[PDB]
């Protein structure tokens, strides 16, 4: 579990969104595994607006932050699961790192701010949904 809290927005994995998230919906995209809801209180996270391909992510199944190198956002095949049919997930970045399903929502960051959130895994792989192109998160 986990979210990004920027401005009056809460960014979560779409497959983990709550009823309150759906009832206060700003934007959602199944192809990216992202959902954004509105918040009453202002958040403290800042979004990175950069070209970093190295950063650090939080792994809840280890209670640890790990440094990682990650690929550029791309369209990657994600097999049918208990949350989606077989499809291509867009804006996904892969790295070598430990992950488990409950690790979704952990933040990936660089020196510029938040880059994305854990969305996918694999044997020694972790995938992150990028948020750096969502410029509207910085306003309203
Ligand atoms: N974004 C998606 O489509 C995920 C929905 C849940 C299923 N998805 C997965 O990748 C996994 C679960 C997972 C493990 C570790 C993670 F950090 C994030 C998810 C692992 C690979 C195959 C089986 O399920 C894909
Ligand atoms: Zn950066």
CA distance 69 to 27: 29
Q: Other C-beta atoms within 10 Å of 72: how many?
A: 11
- Ligand 1 binding pocket mutation candidate from 30, 60, 101 (most atoms within 8 A of CB): 101
β-sheet with 107-110: strand ranges across: 64-69, 54-59, 107-110, 113-120, 125-130, 87-96, 74-78
**DSSP assignment, residue 47?**
B
Q: Where are the beta strands (DSSP E) in 1-140?
A: 4-6, 9-13, 25-29, 34-38, 54-59, 64-69, 74-78, 87-96, 107-110, 113-120, 125-130
Q: How far is 49 from 111, CA to CA, in rounded Å?
A: 10
Q: How many whole angstroms from 47 Cα to the centroid of ligand 1?
A: 24
**Domain spans in the chain, listed from the N-terminal domain onward:** 3-44, 45-140
Binding site annotation covers 110? yes
3-state secondary structure 58-84: EECCCCEEEEEECCCCEEEEECCCCCC
Task: State yes or no: is 104 an active-site residue.
Answer: yes
Give the Cα-Cα-Cα angle 71, 115, 128 (nearest 5 degrees). 50
Please tell me the distance from the alpha carbon of residue 119 to that of residue 79, in angstroms, as a whole number: 13
Distances (CA, A) of 27 to 9, 17, 94, 105, 137: 10, 12, 24, 17, 11
Catalytic residue among 15, 29, 45, 98: 15
Please say whether the beta carbons of 125 and 92 come within 8 A.
Answer: no
What's the resolution in A? 1.2
Beta-bridge partners for 108: 57, 116
């Amino acid at each position: 579990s986990g979210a990004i809290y920027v401005g009056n927005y809460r960014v979560v994995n779409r497959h983990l969104a709550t009823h309150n998230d759906w009832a206060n919906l700003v934007w959602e995209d199944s192809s990216r595994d992202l959902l954004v809801s509105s918040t009453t209180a202002q958040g403290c996270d800042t979004i990175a607006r950069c070209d970093c391909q190295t950063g650090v992510y939080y792994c809840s199944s280890r209670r640890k932050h790990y440094p990682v190198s990650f690929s550029k956002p791309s369209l990657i095949f994600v097999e049918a699961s208990e949350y989606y049919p077989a499809r291509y997930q867009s804006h996904l970045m892969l790295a070598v790192g430990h992950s488990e399903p409950g690790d979704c929502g952990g933040i990936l960051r660089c020196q510029h701010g938040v880059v994305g959130i854990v969305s996918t895994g694999g044997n020694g792989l972790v995938g992150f949904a990028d948020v750096r192109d969502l410029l509207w998160l910085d306003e309203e």
